[PDB]
Amino acid sequence: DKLLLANWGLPKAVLEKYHSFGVKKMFEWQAECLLLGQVLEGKNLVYSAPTSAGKTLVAELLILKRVLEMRKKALFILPFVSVAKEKKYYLQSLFQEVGIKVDGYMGSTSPSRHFSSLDIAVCTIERANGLINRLIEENKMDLLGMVVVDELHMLGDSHRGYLLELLLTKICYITRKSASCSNAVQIVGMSATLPNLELVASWLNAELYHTDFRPVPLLESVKVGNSIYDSSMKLVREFEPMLQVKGDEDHVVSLCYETICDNHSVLLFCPSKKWCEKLADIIAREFYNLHHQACPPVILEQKELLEVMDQLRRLPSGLDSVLQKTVPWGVAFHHAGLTFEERDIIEGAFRQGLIRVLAATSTLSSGVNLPARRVIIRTPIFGGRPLDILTYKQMVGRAGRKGVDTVGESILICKNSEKSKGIALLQGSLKPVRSCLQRREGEEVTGSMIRAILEIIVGGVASTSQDMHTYAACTFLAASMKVQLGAIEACVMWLLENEFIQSTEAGKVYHPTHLGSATLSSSLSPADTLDIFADLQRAMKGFVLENDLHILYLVTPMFEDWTTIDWYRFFCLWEKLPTSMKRVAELVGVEEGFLARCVKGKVVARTERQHRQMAIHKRFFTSLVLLDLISEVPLREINQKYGCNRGQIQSLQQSAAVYAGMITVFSNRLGWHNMELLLSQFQKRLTFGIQRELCDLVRVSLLNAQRARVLYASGFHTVADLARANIVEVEVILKNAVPNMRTIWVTGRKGLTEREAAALIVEEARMILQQDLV
């Protein structure tokens, strides 16, 4: 037998840690994937297995093979910051004991370790591409030995999807060019079972592995009326409801209750925030009725659920008025309107089995591993459309708790009017992946192709048109075709006419300008960079230093439907808005006659002139919300003042802090030294949402804006003075100022006691000095 990780011969420290995770023995498919010929010898690999099959273990063992037997660095590229955070702390708590230094590049976060000191960088797609562009700039591509790509099916039709192709095409081009005129950078890709996954493997010259193995079977089925029908439209059951819930006709509450009697846990995907909250309220009342009616009674581990409510109540947002009534029973909800900290606690309490029913929006289906014993889906229609089969299979694939269940179950609840949509979701299979670089009818260029051509010219890895046609032959567009020769020339002509690149006589040799080099280094989209450049110049002709709002208008993103603006509120603020802020508004182009039109009725954009005229006002409203964040105005007071949800504000922080970083590097490369001197404070300041003084203390990763303000209020104004602090004094400050059941929540950890958090804070401050002095 050679399926035990001990016989595979891993380092002792990771082996013992894997045993502590229960990973005693790998699946036959993982061994068969790792023994797939040259895969263990550096050839690229692409494999697809169900997410619950433990698919990432194969990538983790290949990272060891490329960071130990070669002392070369590896990227781990992930679709979302939460997944990147979770994977970062998992990899750290696994590999740190062999000395492999894991850190990561995700959102506005950046490591205090320089990349030369890393072995593994856990990246989001956008931060990975920015990293590779810098390694090309530095001529340090010799430092990479691997790239691991999760969710490689993201490669198609997505706003950050093509960045994954633009990354992998550059890695392929530079390596294959170096060989043509051992695989240097092993790419490991993980995907859904796309029908054209052979093509992606052949594009990457990868070995392909596919399996449909799941560690527990999956009774994927549909319910209509009382009848529950199989995917083949055999009858599975006729559902007698255990509970006569009078308020709801689809029996969903009794369909949850049916398995809760077994002490199993249910996950319940709902079309919308209000449908989740309405449904979680109903289910909790039926558990309350059932408890007094006591059809077995529920046992709820009640003392632990009280701790969950205490942790929630000690967040800056407090205990949600709907969570207050549901959570005591082990019923809750999970939706994009909650904070990240509320969601992380509620995800944790569901994982621990304290919360037994969770009504969730579709956004849970991608960003977390929550295994559930039933996955109910309340309708085949979501957001006014049929479900995407990728989303539906991301939902249903969460049925079955690995090693706990015999089989997973999923019920699509379906009306008689919807049965044809329902069966189509059950039987349907994913669309083949197709790249964004296919310019549509009526398009001469695409922003993805322009960025591709810019990155190679400004990076210098393609200089002539002979090289640009050679680069394109490495593209998944070409591999899918195997027009494009014209698409290259059209993109070159746009960059030339604006002089992001300058043409010179040899054929033609093309070189960047400073505007090209700045737009590359910023990672801004070059089509937008013409507006950003002209905006920043026009600000420098006359900048209002009188407040930070004119800076916030420049670092705030373009509007992204992050909220629905209440224009009657906005104009009623525009009266009270301070004159030092209405002076900014005049400079940036906000107009109160157009606000009156927005109050008067619907306003629309027929022209690009009218599109920006509206964007200017939405961008100003966003900058006011940021100005309240930047001044530590509580999220409840921002909500009441502007109408935003907590999760809308907290997600605006992430994009504004990312964008504040880009605009700093853009101004730095152009040499607007007076702008970068002003802008550079705002990335950290927006990320946490703090005054200028907290910005030093916040360097401690245990301190958020709340904990930094209580330490600043006590007198620990700086990290050096905090490192001096007596641990008992930090304890007493936290013990007093925050208002042992894990009082404090730390996003990288479970909840901490006051004694544990205070000691870790002081020792982390001392370590930061050691790292800063070194």
JSON list of C-alpha atoms in Angstrom, two decimals, residues 619-749:
[
{"chain": "A", "resi": 619, "resn": "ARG", "atom": "CA", "xyz": [-18.83, 59.21, -7.69]},
{"chain": "A", "resi": 620, "resn": "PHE", "atom": "CA", "xyz": [-19.27, 62.23, -5.40]},
{"chain": "A", "resi": 621, "resn": "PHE", "atom": "CA", "xyz": [-21.93, 60.46, -3.31]},
{"chain": "A", "resi": 622, "resn": "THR", "atom": "CA", "xyz": [-19.50, 57.55, -2.95]},
{"chain": "A", "resi": 623, "resn": "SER", "atom": "CA", "xyz": [-16.73, 59.90, -1.78]},
{"chain": "A", "resi": 624, "resn": "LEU", "atom": "CA", "xyz": [-19.00, 61.30, 0.95]},
{"chain": "A", "resi": 625, "resn": "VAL", "atom": "CA", "xyz": [-19.64, 57.76, 2.23]},
{"chain": "A", "resi": 626, "resn": "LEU", "atom": "CA", "xyz": [-15.86, 57.20, 2.21]},
{"chain": "A", "resi": 627, "resn": "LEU", "atom": "CA", "xyz": [-15.30, 60.49, 4.06]},
{"chain": "A", "resi": 628, "resn": "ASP", "atom": "CA", "xyz": [-17.53, 59.17, 6.86]},
{"chain": "A", "resi": 629, "resn": "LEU", "atom": "CA", "xyz": [-15.61, 55.88, 6.85]},
{"chain": "A", "resi": 630, "resn": "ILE", "atom": "CA", "xyz": [-12.32, 57.80, 6.87]},
{"chain": "A", "resi": 631, "resn": "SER", "atom": "CA", "xyz": [-13.55, 59.70, 9.95]},
{"chain": "A", "resi": 632, "resn": "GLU", "atom": "CA", "xyz": [-14.61, 56.49, 11.76]},
{"chain": "A", "resi": 633, "resn": "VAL", "atom": "CA", "xyz": [-18.33, 57.29, 11.59]},
{"chain": "A", "resi": 634, "resn": "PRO", "atom": "CA", "xyz": [-20.07, 54.08, 12.76]},
{"chain": "A", "resi": 635, "resn": "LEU", "atom": "CA", "xyz": [-21.55, 51.85, 10.07]},
{"chain": "A", "resi": 636, "resn": "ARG", "atom": "CA", "xyz": [-24.99, 52.16, 11.70]},
{"chain": "A", "resi": 637, "resn": "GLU", "atom": "CA", "xyz": [-24.77, 55.96, 11.48]},
{"chain": "A", "resi": 638, "resn": "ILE", "atom": "CA", "xyz": [-23.57, 55.80, 7.86]},
{"chain": "A", "resi": 639, "resn": "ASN", "atom": "CA", "xyz": [-26.43, 53.39, 7.11]},
{"chain": "A", "resi": 640, "resn": "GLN", "atom": "CA", "xyz": [-29.00, 55.75, 8.64]},
{"chain": "A", "resi": 641, "resn": "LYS", "atom": "CA", "xyz": [-27.42, 58.77, 6.92]},
{"chain": "A", "resi": 642, "resn": "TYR", "atom": "CA", "xyz": [-26.93, 57.31, 3.41]},
{"chain": "A", "resi": 643, "resn": "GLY", "atom": "CA", "xyz": [-29.07, 54.15, 3.28]},
{"chain": "A", "resi": 644, "resn": "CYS", "atom": "CA", "xyz": [-26.18, 51.76, 2.56]},
{"chain": "A", "resi": 645, "resn": "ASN", "atom": "CA", "xyz": [-26.05, 48.28, 4.01]},
{"chain": "A", "resi": 646, "resn": "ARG", "atom": "CA", "xyz": [-23.08, 47.34, 6.20]},
{"chain": "A", "resi": 647, "resn": "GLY", "atom": "CA", "xyz": [-21.80, 44.94, 3.54]},
{"chain": "A", "resi": 648, "resn": "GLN", "atom": "CA", "xyz": [-22.12, 47.51, 0.78]},
{"chain": "A", "resi": 649, "resn": "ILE", "atom": "CA", "xyz": [-19.98, 49.96, 2.78]},
{"chain": "A", "resi": 650, "resn": "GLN", "atom": "CA", "xyz": [-17.45, 47.27, 3.73]},
{"chain": "A", "resi": 651, "resn": "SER", "atom": "CA", "xyz": [-17.12, 46.13, 0.12]},
{"chain": "A", "resi": 652, "resn": "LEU", "atom": "CA", "xyz": [-16.73, 49.72, -1.09]},
{"chain": "A", "resi": 653, "resn": "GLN", "atom": "CA", "xyz": [-13.79, 49.96, 1.34]},
{"chain": "A", "resi": 654, "resn": "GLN", "atom": "CA", "xyz": [-12.04, 47.08, -0.42]},
{"chain": "A", "resi": 655, "resn": "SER", "atom": "CA", "xyz": [-12.40, 48.45, -3.97]},
{"chain": "A", "resi": 656, "resn": "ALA", "atom": "CA", "xyz": [-11.60, 52.03, -2.91]},
{"chain": "A", "resi": 657, "resn": "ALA", "atom": "CA", "xyz": [-8.48, 50.84, -1.08]},
{"chain": "A", "resi": 658, "resn": "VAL", "atom": "CA", "xyz": [-7.39, 48.81, -4.12]},
{"chain": "A", "resi": 659, "resn": "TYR", "atom": "CA", "xyz": [-8.00, 51.82, -6.37]},
{"chain": "A", "resi": 660, "resn": "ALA", "atom": "CA", "xyz": [-6.21, 54.20, -3.98]},
{"chain": "A", "resi": 661, "resn": "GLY", "atom": "CA", "xyz": [-3.13, 52.00, -4.43]},
{"chain": "A", "resi": 662, "resn": "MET", "atom": "CA", "xyz": [-3.28, 52.14, -8.23]},
{"chain": "A", "resi": 663, "resn": "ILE", "atom": "CA", "xyz": [-3.61, 55.94, -8.35]},
{"chain": "A", "resi": 664, "resn": "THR", "atom": "CA", "xyz": [-0.57, 56.34, -6.08]},
{"chain": "A", "resi": 665, "resn": "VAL", "atom": "CA", "xyz": [1.69, 54.19, -8.30]},
{"chain": "A", "resi": 666, "resn": "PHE", "atom": "CA", "xyz": [0.26, 55.90, -11.40]},
{"chain": "A", "resi": 667, "resn": "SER", "atom": "CA", "xyz": [1.19, 59.35, -10.06]},
{"chain": "A", "resi": 668, "resn": "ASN", "atom": "CA", "xyz": [4.57, 58.08, -8.82]},
{"chain": "A", "resi": 669, "resn": "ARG", "atom": "CA", "xyz": [5.55, 56.73, -12.24]},
{"chain": "A", "resi": 670, "resn": "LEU", "atom": "CA", "xyz": [4.45, 59.95, -13.95]},
{"chain": "A", "resi": 671, "resn": "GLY", "atom": "CA", "xyz": [6.37, 61.89, -11.28]},
{"chain": "A", "resi": 672, "resn": "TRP", "atom": "CA", "xyz": [3.48, 63.87, -9.77]},
{"chain": "A", "resi": 673, "resn": "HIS", "atom": "CA", "xyz": [5.41, 63.80, -6.51]},
{"chain": "A", "resi": 674, "resn": "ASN", "atom": "CA", "xyz": [2.98, 66.19, -4.79]},
{"chain": "A", "resi": 675, "resn": "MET", "atom": "CA", "xyz": [0.03, 63.92, -5.61]},
{"chain": "A", "resi": 676, "resn": "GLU", "atom": "CA", "xyz": [1.61, 60.65, -4.46]},
{"chain": "A", "resi": 677, "resn": "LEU", "atom": "CA", "xyz": [2.68, 62.43, -1.26]},
{"chain": "A", "resi": 678, "resn": "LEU", "atom": "CA", "xyz": [-1.00, 63.19, -0.57]},
{"chain": "A", "resi": 679, "resn": "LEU", "atom": "CA", "xyz": [-2.56, 60.00, -1.97]},
{"chain": "A", "resi": 680, "resn": "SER", "atom": "CA", "xyz": [-0.22, 57.44, -0.37]},
{"chain": "A", "resi": 681, "resn": "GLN", "atom": "CA", "xyz": [-1.82, 57.74, 3.10]},
{"chain": "A", "resi": 682, "resn": "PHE", "atom": "CA", "xyz": [-5.26, 56.76, 1.80]},
{"chain": "A", "resi": 683, "resn": "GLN", "atom": "CA", "xyz": [-4.76, 53.08, 0.89]},
{"chain": "A", "resi": 684, "resn": "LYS", "atom": "CA", "xyz": [-4.18, 52.03, 4.51]},
{"chain": "A", "resi": 685, "resn": "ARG", "atom": "CA", "xyz": [-6.53, 54.74, 5.80]},
{"chain": "A", "resi": 686, "resn": "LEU", "atom": "CA", "xyz": [-9.36, 53.50, 3.55]},
{"chain": "A", "resi": 687, "resn": "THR", "atom": "CA", "xyz": [-8.59, 49.79, 4.07]},
{"chain": "A", "resi": 688, "resn": "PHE", "atom": "CA", "xyz": [-9.18, 49.98, 7.84]},
{"chain": "A", "resi": 689, "resn": "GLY", "atom": "CA", "xyz": [-11.22, 53.19, 7.92]},
{"chain": "A", "resi": 690, "resn": "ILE", "atom": "CA", "xyz": [-9.24, 55.16, 10.48]},
{"chain": "A", "resi": 691, "resn": "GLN", "atom": "CA", "xyz": [-7.98, 58.59, 11.39]},
{"chain": "A", "resi": 692, "resn": "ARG", "atom": "CA", "xyz": [-4.40, 59.47, 10.48]},
{"chain": "A", "resi": 693, "resn": "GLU", "atom": "CA", "xyz": [-3.05, 58.68, 13.96]},
{"chain": "A", "resi": 694, "resn": "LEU", "atom": "CA", "xyz": [-4.31, 55.08, 14.15]},
{"chain": "A", "resi": 695, "resn": "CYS", "atom": "CA", "xyz": [-2.38, 54.29, 10.94]},
{"chain": "A", "resi": 696, "resn": "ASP", "atom": "CA", "xyz": [0.76, 53.43, 12.91]},
{"chain": "A", "resi": 697, "resn": "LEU", "atom": "CA", "xyz": [-0.96, 51.25, 15.53]},
{"chain": "A", "resi": 698, "resn": "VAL", "atom": "CA", "xyz": [-2.95, 49.39, 12.84]},
{"chain": "A", "resi": 699, "resn": "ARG", "atom": "CA", "xyz": [0.33, 47.89, 11.59]},
{"chain": "A", "resi": 700, "resn": "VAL", "atom": "CA", "xyz": [-0.49, 45.31, 14.27]},
{"chain": "A", "resi": 701, "resn": "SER", "atom": "CA", "xyz": [-2.72, 42.87, 12.39]},
{"chain": "A", "resi": 702, "resn": "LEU", "atom": "CA", "xyz": [-4.61, 42.01, 15.59]},
{"chain": "A", "resi": 703, "resn": "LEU", "atom": "CA", "xyz": [-5.80, 45.64, 15.78]},
{"chain": "A", "resi": 704, "resn": "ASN", "atom": "CA", "xyz": [-8.77, 46.86, 13.78]},
{"chain": "A", "resi": 705, "resn": "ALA", "atom": "CA", "xyz": [-10.11, 50.43, 13.95]},
{"chain": "A", "resi": 706, "resn": "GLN", "atom": "CA", "xyz": [-12.06, 49.60, 17.12]},
{"chain": "A", "resi": 707, "resn": "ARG", "atom": "CA", "xyz": [-9.16, 48.07, 19.06]},
{"chain": "A", "resi": 708, "resn": "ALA", "atom": "CA", "xyz": [-6.68, 50.66, 17.75]},
{"chain": "A", "resi": 709, "resn": "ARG", "atom": "CA", "xyz": [-8.91, 53.49, 18.99]},
{"chain": "A", "resi": 710, "resn": "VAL", "atom": "CA", "xyz": [-9.18, 52.01, 22.49]},
{"chain": "A", "resi": 711, "resn": "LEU", "atom": "CA", "xyz": [-5.39, 51.61, 22.68]},
{"chain": "A", "resi": 712, "resn": "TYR", "atom": "CA", "xyz": [-4.91, 55.10, 21.24]},
{"chain": "A", "resi": 713, "resn": "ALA", "atom": "CA", "xyz": [-7.49, 56.47, 23.68]},
{"chain": "A", "resi": 714, "resn": "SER", "atom": "CA", "xyz": [-5.59, 54.93, 26.60]},
{"chain": "A", "resi": 715, "resn": "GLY", "atom": "CA", "xyz": [-2.29, 56.44, 25.45]},
{"chain": "A", "resi": 716, "resn": "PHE", "atom": "CA", "xyz": [-0.53, 53.74, 23.41]},
{"chain": "A", "resi": 717, "resn": "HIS", "atom": "CA", "xyz": [-0.17, 56.09, 20.47]},
{"chain": "A", "resi": 718, "resn": "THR", "atom": "CA", "xyz": [2.58, 54.15, 18.64]},
{"chain": "A", "resi": 719, "resn": "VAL", "atom": "CA", "xyz": [3.64, 50.55, 18.02]},
{"chain": "A", "resi": 720, "resn": "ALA", "atom": "CA", "xyz": [6.95, 51.08, 19.82]},
{"chain": "A", "resi": 721, "resn": "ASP", "atom": "CA", "xyz": [5.07, 52.32, 22.89]},
{"chain": "A", "resi": 722, "resn": "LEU", "atom": "CA", "xyz": [2.62, 49.41, 22.57]},
{"chain": "A", "resi": 723, "resn": "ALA", "atom": "CA", "xyz": [5.51, 46.93, 22.41]},
{"chain": "A", "resi": 724, "resn": "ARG", "atom": "CA", "xyz": [6.67, 48.36, 25.75]},
{"chain": "A", "resi": 725, "resn": "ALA", "atom": "CA", "xyz": [3.22, 47.89, 27.31]},
{"chain": "A", "resi": 726, "resn": "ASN", "atom": "CA", "xyz": [2.61, 45.61, 30.26]},
{"chain": "A", "resi": 727, "resn": "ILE", "atom": "CA", "xyz": [0.39, 42.78, 29.01]},
{"chain": "A", "resi": 728, "resn": "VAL", "atom": "CA", "xyz": [-1.87, 43.09, 32.07]},
{"chain": "A", "resi": 729, "resn": "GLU", "atom": "CA", "xyz": [-2.48, 46.75, 31.22]},
{"chain": "A", "resi": 730, "resn": "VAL", "atom": "CA", "xyz": [-3.47, 45.95, 27.63]},
{"chain": "A", "resi": 731, "resn": "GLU", "atom": "CA", "xyz": [-5.80, 43.28, 29.03]},
{"chain": "A", "resi": 732, "resn": "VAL", "atom": "CA", "xyz": [-7.50, 45.74, 31.39]},
{"chain": "A", "resi": 733, "resn": "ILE", "atom": "CA", "xyz": [-7.91, 48.33, 28.62]},
{"chain": "A", "resi": 734, "resn": "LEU", "atom": "CA", "xyz": [-9.53, 45.76, 26.33]},
{"chain": "A", "resi": 735, "resn": "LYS", "atom": "CA", "xyz": [-11.59, 44.30, 29.20]},
{"chain": "A", "resi": 736, "resn": "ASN", "atom": "CA", "xyz": [-12.94, 47.78, 29.98]},
{"chain": "A", "resi": 737, "resn": "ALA", "atom": "CA", "xyz": [-13.04, 49.57, 26.63]},
{"chain": "A", "resi": 738, "resn": "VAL", "atom": "CA", "xyz": [-14.55, 46.84, 24.42]},
{"chain": "A", "resi": 739, "resn": "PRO", "atom": "CA", "xyz": [-17.91, 46.71, 26.26]},
{"chain": "A", "resi": 740, "resn": "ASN", "atom": "CA", "xyz": [-14.33, 33.97, 28.99]},
{"chain": "A", "resi": 741, "resn": "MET", "atom": "CA", "xyz": [-16.53, 33.20, 25.97]},
{"chain": "A", "resi": 742, "resn": "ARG", "atom": "CA", "xyz": [-13.88, 34.22, 23.42]},
{"chain": "A", "resi": 743, "resn": "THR", "atom": "CA", "xyz": [-14.71, 37.91, 23.67]},
{"chain": "A", "resi": 744, "resn": "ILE", "atom": "CA", "xyz": [-12.62, 39.16, 20.72]},
{"chain": "A", "resi": 745, "resn": "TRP", "atom": "CA", "xyz": [-12.89, 38.02, 17.09]},
{"chain": "A", "resi": 746, "resn": "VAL", "atom": "CA", "xyz": [-9.70, 37.90, 15.00]},
{"chain": "A", "resi": 747, "resn": "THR", "atom": "CA", "xyz": [-10.25, 37.26, 11.30]},
{"chain": "A", "resi": 748, "resn": "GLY", "atom": "CA", "xyz": [-7.29, 34.89, 11.07]},
{"chain": "A", "resi": 749, "resn": "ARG", "atom": "CA", "xyz": [-8.34, 32.92, 14.15]}
]
